[PDB]
Amino acid sequence: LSSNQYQLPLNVRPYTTTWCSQSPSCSNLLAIGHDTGITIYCASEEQTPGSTGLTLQELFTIQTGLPTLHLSFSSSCSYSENLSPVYSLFLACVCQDNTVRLIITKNETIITQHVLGGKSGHHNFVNDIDIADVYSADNRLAEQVIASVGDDCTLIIWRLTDEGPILAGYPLSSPGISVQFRPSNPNQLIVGERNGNIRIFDWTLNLSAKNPWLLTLNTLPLVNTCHSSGIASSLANVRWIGSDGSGILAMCKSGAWLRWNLFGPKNLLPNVQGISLFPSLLGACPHPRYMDYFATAHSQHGLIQLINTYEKDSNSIPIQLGMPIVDFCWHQDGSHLAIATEGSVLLTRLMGFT
Amino acid sequence: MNELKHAVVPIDLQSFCLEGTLALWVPALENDSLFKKECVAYDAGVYTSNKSKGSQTLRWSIFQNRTLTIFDVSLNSKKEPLSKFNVKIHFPSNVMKDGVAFSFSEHSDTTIIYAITHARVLYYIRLSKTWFQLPDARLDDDWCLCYRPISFLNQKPDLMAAISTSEICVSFFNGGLTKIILNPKDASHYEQHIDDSKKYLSLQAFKADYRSPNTIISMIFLSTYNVLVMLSLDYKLKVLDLSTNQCVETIELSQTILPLQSFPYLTSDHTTNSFIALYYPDNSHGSFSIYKLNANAHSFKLNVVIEKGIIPPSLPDDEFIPWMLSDFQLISSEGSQSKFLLIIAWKSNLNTVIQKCNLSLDQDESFSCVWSHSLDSFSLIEKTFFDVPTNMSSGDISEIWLQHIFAHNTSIESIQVALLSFQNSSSQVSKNKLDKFGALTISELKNAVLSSIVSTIQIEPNSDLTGYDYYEYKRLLYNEWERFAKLVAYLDHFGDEILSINFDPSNAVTYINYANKVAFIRDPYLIESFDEEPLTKLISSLIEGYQILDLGRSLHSCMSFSTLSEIRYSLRELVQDLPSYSLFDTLWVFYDKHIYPNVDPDYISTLIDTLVSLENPMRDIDSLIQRLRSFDIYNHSAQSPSLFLCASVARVLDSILKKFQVSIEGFIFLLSLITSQQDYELQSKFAGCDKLFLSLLEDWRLVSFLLENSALLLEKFEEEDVNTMEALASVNTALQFFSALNESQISPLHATVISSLSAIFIRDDTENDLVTELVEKLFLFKQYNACMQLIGWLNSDPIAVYLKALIYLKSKEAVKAVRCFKTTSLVLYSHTSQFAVLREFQEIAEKYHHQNLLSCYYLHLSKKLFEESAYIDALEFSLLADASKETDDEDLSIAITHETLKTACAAGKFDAAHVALMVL
Secondary structure: OEEEEEEOOOOOOEEEEEEOOOOHHHOOEEEEEEOOEEEEEEEEOOOOOOOOOOEEEEEEEEEOOOOOOOEEEOOOOEEEOOOOOEEEEEEEEEOOOOOEEEEEEEOOEEEEEEEEOOOOOOOOOEEEEEEEEEEOOOOOEEEEEEEEEEOOOEEEEEEEEOOEEEEEEEEOOOOEEEEEEEOOEEEEEEEEEOOOEEEEEEOOOOOOOOOOOEEEEEOHHHOOOOOOOOOOOOEEEEEEEOOOOOEEEEEEOOOEEEEEEOOOOOOOOOOEEEEOOOOOOOOOEEOOOOOOEEEEEEOOOOEEEEEEOOOOOOOEEEEEOOOOEEEEEEOOOOOEEEEEEOOEEEEEEOHHHO | OEEOEEEEOOHHHHHHHOOOEEEEOOOOOOOOOOHHHHHHOOOOOOOEEEEEOOOOOEEEEEEEOOEEEEEOOOOOOOOOOOOOOEEEEEOOOOOOOOOOOOEEEEOOOEEEEEEEOOOOOEEEEEEEHHHHHOOOOOOOOOOEOOEOOOOOOOOOEEEEEEOOOOEEEEEEOOOOEEEEEEEOOEEEEEEEOOOOOOOOOOOOOOOOOOOOOOOEEEEEEEOOOOEEEEEEOOOEEEEEEOOOOEEEEEEEOOOOOOOOOOOOOOOOEEEOOOOEEEOOOOHHHOOOOOOOEEOOEOOOOEOOEEOOOOOOOOOOOOOOOOOOEEEEEEEEOOOOOOOEEEEEEEEEOOEEEEEEEEEOOOOOOOOOEEEEEOOOOOOOOOOOOOOOOOOHHHOOOHHHHHHHHHHHOOOOHHHHHHHHHHOOOOOOOOOHHHHHHHHOOHHHHHHHHHHHHHOOOOOOEOOOOOOEOHHHHHHHHHHHHHHHHHHHHHOOOOOOOEEEOOOOOOOOOOEEEEOOOOEEEEOOOHHHHHHOOOHHHHHHOOOOOHHHHHHHHHHHHHOOHHHHHHHHHHHHOOOOOHHHOOOOOHHHHHHHHHOOOOOOHHHHHHHHHHHHOOOOHHHHHHHHHHOOOOOOOOOOOOOOOHHHHHHHHHHHHHHHHHHHHHHHHHHHHHHHHOOOOHHHHOOOOOOOOHHHHHHHHHHHHHHHHHHHHOOOOOOOOOOOOOOHHHHOOOOOOOHHHHHHOOOOOOOHHHHHHHHHHHHHHOOOOOOOOHHHHHHHHHHHHOOOOHHHHHHHHOOOOHHHHHHHHHHHHHOOOHHHHHHHHHOOOOOOOOOOOOOOOHHHHHHHHHOOOOOOOOHHHHHHHHHHHHHOOOOHHHHHHHHHHHHOOOOOOHHHHHHHHHHHHHHHHHOOOOOHHHOOOOOO
């Protein structure tokens, strides 16, 4: 295989990483949330060898002065030139002060910032965040929506509209540990409580003047039990799969994974089930192009297993580092992998997916 | 009359506090001989038998179709009267269709039991106490010897009665009494065989069910040394000497319409100590009696003197409902002949009444008897709590119902039966039955339950555009789990049954035997008496304030279910977050949350009129409620057993739920009053009440904290490293609390619950939140996962903080654990009142020969960060240690620089100023 390693500045301690897959115009953008801000990189095809025909170039560093735990690009990100070029960025993040912020930037200069914290925001630590752009029928930018879930047993829906902000708070039966809007349908989203509950949720259900949020799945009782998943199988992750949001993949801390599918007829059980070799503290990161594929990590010993849901996998571990893995994500092309460890970021190419 | 109350024991929770379950067989050759049928006949308990001796220990026996069963429910104080396991003895045929086959007597540190199969054989089994204590599977001896002493074929036995370890008596329908001597490879036998049947008068009207006018109805045994008491079919009182094997005394009681009444099983006689009593119902009058005989044994011959006439009944049994004396036992106070207490059990079908009669006499030929009453009834909380699952406080649907079956926590194998009966899909039983027996493990049960439920309810789509009709899933799920739990309630409207009662000398406790559901008798607690809403009864039973309490209880009962859901969520949000706001303005805000329910302004003003008419509300309320705090004594514990912890768990879930009720009541009122006319509220004509409001809210936090705590049974023996420490080594939850809070003239259970409830009530005196104490200690052993939501709940305190830290560590979500570590410190070190975690920081402080303000703590945090194996945060903290040192010790500075050196060795390299600028 072929890996290229690129050093984060030695004083930069990473906490999260992510690609801008949500926006095709800046899909070569890589963000690193650290203890003082967010660092932006760009991925580019050198001639290289046609082994890893992709290299990373460090663009710039947006200082914020405080830890960035989670990070999400929006579809509003753009690129421009004056010939010199300018990047217009939209970043949703979580800071040390238990606040949830939306920072809008022009390159490294921070031009705008909205903050949601204190008692109005989450009343405990924030665990996960995601963002989506909502347009009207006339197709102007109507709303920017940021959703967050917390250890205050709360899902907070945050709306930023032309006429200003709209805050909404909702209860959960347990801490919220994961959350994500549904692809091709921003009207819906999915919520991931700690206890193993999975919420399918329509946030447009009330306007001006009757229905609950929609659906609730649960992984804890569905564990195959052919091999006991252990006493504490805390839900680590829940993610939509497909370009229409036609699927759901759930992952425990134990490594046990489950898939459901969303289109025909009536349904009585999770469509497929399985188990990873190692715990998945970070959960799974679904492949952007092959619905059957996702990646999990033994973050303490620095390994990454690749799993196929229809068992085409047969245990494929294309990635083995000698150091702890802090975070990771798939480049849009689907063959490259971007991985952040405590001092570096690696871009690795798996020849099999090109 | 005064009331009494029961305390029910789920058999599965027994199986919780009992790690293993062993099954023994015995030599079986010659032994004489569709779903709902097999399910009904699956479990029952043909009879129930419970014994205990003067020496030490105590067990209970459950009977079964083709099967015998037994377990350990003792409350003792030994080295290991706590580590327990359950015993299943298989039989070639059942233990007779009748109440016979049971006997228990000991000898020396062992238990010897006598049994009878359906047909014609005896069983003699010797079980070691050690055998009981050990989890081990192995036995190395001949535990049992079956034998047929006399021919039971000729004369079938109707009554069995032990006298000693070697010897045991049997009584036949014919009327003869045999005595059976056993020994290893030996058996010698004895008799007082009697056959009893003019001939013209026996030619006609002769046909009847088989009888023999020298039969004995029920025998009883009392040792001064060796004496028996007997009641015959001739209805003569015969007294028996063991040495003689002959009737020492005879008394003639002349009743003709009395033998006309014949009962299956039933104990016609029982006993206190040296004296003994018995009684005859006198048929439909239901009069019964107490003929407590005093047997004055003289050297020439043992003498008999009966001293009392008749004891009246209660009259609630009517409507042709057949009252039936199930069993009774007579127990007097050995302290002094001032009182005598008889315990009596009545049953009609599945339903049951229980009562105790206390006679206080000394010289009076009069009859001074206090009576207690009990009520057994079924109140269905089912049908209405089902409809609304709209809020995510307890979202989805299924999980809630599951938590309802767990909230009941009183019915057991009925569930299993139902589960693997619904999963059949018109499948049989004979093979699926074994599939029921196989599962065993409880944690997985619920998983199997949900997996089976979802596999039965088809989700029909909405037919709009690849959409689904959740609104059908609604009714489907509701009526599904409803029908299910209705079959459940029907499997304990067939199961919940009582059979016997057995008093214990060593423990002095009011034991009870229900079919497959052990229980206990207890006096009404104040909360119970005031939750009955006995307003009219209290009237029937300086006097103000109580009508407000009852009417108010009604007011709480007025609210809906989703209402209490919202309320529970809101208070759950009021555990941690509330102290941040200005404390006394939220008062009116809570009523501002109370307008959303019905709350007709008519009801409001109707109450307001009462309020304005109050003399002086606060000065009566605060005091009269302050008088509710109980009297705990000693609070020191011996090595405690397991029935202790589990039974106290169930009873405490009941009491705590009623407490949540009464408290919620109290608050709801307190702000339903002080809402409108705000200016007049602040006029201070009333005493005001904000302080006691706050105090009460502390109380509620604790109460609902436990109410949650008795719902997380988590334990495991991965390491399996293991007294009361072994009590924590038992699985059930909430126990640890009771073991933490385990006698002069009072039963142990009551007092050992009293100490707990007292440690709860006490507020400022303890100077510590009981929650912080709990998780502080409990964290150490187990439950590492539950204390996550539990620490996310617990109130912010330094203790609570460092625990938040260590827990957020055990889950290895470093970040937030680290934010907890950062945002706090220690002024608490060298206090030692904190358990088994302070000693670390303190040893560390002393290692620097002094008590440095801070750097030491940070050092401790660096080493602990090593314990997490995560080395980078140690790189962070070792620095803080190295810096904020305000002490300038040589040794200390050296040590700190050293640990900094190690953490650096975990991630150092060449680049100098590149480890100077990275924290957080």
